[PDB]
């Protein structure tokens, strides 16, 4: 009850900022998360003995892949933490609990391959789930861990609060399938401008949480340039591996994934920012004004990639 987590001053200050980088020390990331849960949710939200056991089981089930790893899980959680703190009163007690956990769990047991690569490989998980493949696998894994003895961090909730929080988390994790982002934003877009967006409409909240998750999941583009620049190497390390494996199946990969075509990256990142990230954070800022900082950083980094092409770095 009385065992606050505290952080070094720089971390304690910098963590409340959208563009915070959790840093290269694996060993602090668990404490960082618990810090965020206590300030986001309450020191009463979860039994600490239990939370710690869940955190470490969840860490154990992210794999050693260049990008879709434990560092990604916590990065995404922090970005959600930042959004909840800047929109304090808009979100229910359970929405605060379930969302941070969803973010922590959103990529459980990712292998570094896209849904497309499961289908073309004919991986068993593509047999089992025909769309949002990995994402239903990550939700599947989150319930597996939640059901291990001593890991039910949600046990103090009623039967029905429990059914709501798992249902928040499921949609939350499906929402991170970028295949669904495009329709979800276009629907939120029409609803904000026609002016029918109603946050008391639960099908509306669902979409808005869906956008937040896309925004959190994309937040390596909302960092200081030197972070965004270096994280790009990791996402691209996975892409080129997947390309290598597409080549092995007798399939030319999209250039984005072809390591013979690195020259084409700065242009590929241009497309990405314009088609995906700028729109994501635009629509999110229009809905949740305090989240503007994420749009500014995104824009900044777009500018930096233009600069890369112009020979200027």
The set of catalytic residues is 68
Contacted entry of Mg ion, Zn ion, ligand KG3, none for residue 228, CB cut-off 5 to 8 Å set by kind: ligand KG3
Enumerate residues 6+ apart whose C-beta is below 8 A from 19: 222, 223, 224, 227, 293, 297
Kindly report the length of the chain: 313
Site string for ligand KG3, 158-177 (x = CB under 6 A): --------------------
d(C-alpha 75, C-alpha 50), whole Å: 22
d(C-alpha 242, C-alpha 73), whole Å: 21
Instruction: Look up residue 196 and give its two tokens.
Output: 């029918």
Q: Does 242 bind Mg ion (CB under 5 A)?
A: no
Contacted entry of Zn ion, Mg ion, ligand KG3, none for residue 169, CB cut-off 5 to 8 Å set by kind: none
Enumerate residues 6+ apart whose C-beta is below 8 A from 237: 66, 67
Among 69, 75, 220, 285, binds ligand KG3 (CB under 6 A): 220
List binders of Mg ion among 127-186 (CB under 5 A).
176
107 is annotated as contributing to ligand binding: yes
Rank residues 45 and 135 by Cβ distance to Zn ion and give the closer one.
Answer: 135
Among 20, 46, 62, 272, binds ligand KG3 (CB under 6 A): 272
Among 21, 107, 135, 238, binds Zn ion (CB under 5 A): 107
Distances (CA, A) of 143 to 134, 136, 292: 14, 11, 34
d(C-alpha 184, C-alpha 209), whole Å: 10
Q: Does 269 bind Mg ion (CB under 5 A)?
A: no
d(C-alpha 243, C-alpha 229), whole Å: 21
Shortest distance, position 148 Cβ to ligand KG3, whole Å: 29
Shortest distance, position 67 Cβ to Zn ion, whole Å: 8
d(C-alpha 51, C-alpha 37), whole Å: 10
Q: Does 107 bind Mg ion (CB under 5 A)?
A: yes
Enumerate residues 6+ apart whose C-beta is below 8 A from 67: 112, 231, 234, 235, 237, 238
Contacted entry of Mg ion, Zn ion, ligand KG3, none for residue 215, CB cut-off 5 to 8 Å set by kind: none
Rank residues 95 and 217 by Cβ distance to ligand KG3 and give the closer one.
Answer: 217
Rank residues 149 and 263 by Cβ distance to ligand KG3 and give the closer one.
Answer: 263
Shortest distance, position 184 Cβ to ligand KG3, whole Å: 14
Distances (CA, A) of 10 to 20, 23, 72, 125, 245: 10, 12, 21, 43, 42
Helix and strand element counts for the chain (H, E)? 15, 0
Contacted entry of ligand KG3, Mg ion, Zn ion, none for residue 218, CB cut-off 5 to 8 Å set by kind: ligand KG3
Rank residues 30 and 112 by Cβ distance to Mg ion and give the closer one.
Answer: 112
CB 43 within 8 A of CB 1: yes
Distances (CA, A) of 120 to 5, 110, 176, 243, 257: 46, 17, 21, 12, 15
d(C-alpha 16, C-alpha 13), whole Å: 6
Q: Does 22 bind ligand KG3 (CB under 6 A)?
A: no
Closest residue to ligand KG3: CB criterion: 220
Residues that bind Zn ion (CB under 5 A): 107, 217
**Which residues are part of a known binding site for a divalent metal cation?**
72, 106-107, 217
Q: Which residues contact ligand KG3 (rule: CB under 6 A)?
A: 178, 218, 220-221, 228, 231-232, 235, 256, 268-269, 271-272, 276
Detail the residues annotated as belonging to a binding site for 3',5'-cyclic AMP.
68, 269
Enumerate the known binding-site residues for 3',5'-cyclic GMP. 68, 269
């Amino acid at each position: 009850g009385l065992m606050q987590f505290t952080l070094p001053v720089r971390l304690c200050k910098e963590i409340e900022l959208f563009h915070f980088d959790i840093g290269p020390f694996e060993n602090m990331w668990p404490g960082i998360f618990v810090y965020m849960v206590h300030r986001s949710c309450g020191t009463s939200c979860f039994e600490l003995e239990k939370l710690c056991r869940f955190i470490m089981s969840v860490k154990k089930n992210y794999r050693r892949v260049p990008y879709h790893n434990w560092k990604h899980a916590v990065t995404v959680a922090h970005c959600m933490y930042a959004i909840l703190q800047n929109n304090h009163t808009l979100f229910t007690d359970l929405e605060r609990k379930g969302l941070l956990i969803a973010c922590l769990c959103h990529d459980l047991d990712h292998r570094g391959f896209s849904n497309s690569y499961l289908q073309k490989f004919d991986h068993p998980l593509a047999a089992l789930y025909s769309t949002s493949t990995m994402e239903q696998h990550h939700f599947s894994q989150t319930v597996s861990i939640l059901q291990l003895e001593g890991h039910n961090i949600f046990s103090t909730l009623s039967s029905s609060e429990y059914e709501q929080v798992l249902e928040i988390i499921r949609k939350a994790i499906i929402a991170t399938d970028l295949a669904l982002y495009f329709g979800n934003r276009k629907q939120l877009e029409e609803m904000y401008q026609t002016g029918s967006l109603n946050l008391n409409n639960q099908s509306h909240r669902d979409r808005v949480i869906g956008l937040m998750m896309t925004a959190c999941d994309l937040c390596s583009v909302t960092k200081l340039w030197p972070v965004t620049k270096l994280t790009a190497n990791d996402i691209y390390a996975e892409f080129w591996a997947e390309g290598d494996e597409m080549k092995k199946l007798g399939i030319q990969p999209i250039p984005m994934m072809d390591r013979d075509k690195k020259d084409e990256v700065p242009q590929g990142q241009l497309g990405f920012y314009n088609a995906v990230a700028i729109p994501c954070y635009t629509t999110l800022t229009q809905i949740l004004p305090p989240t503007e900082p994420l749009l500014k950083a995104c824009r900044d980094n777009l500018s930096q990639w233009e600069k890369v092409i112009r020979g200027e770095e």
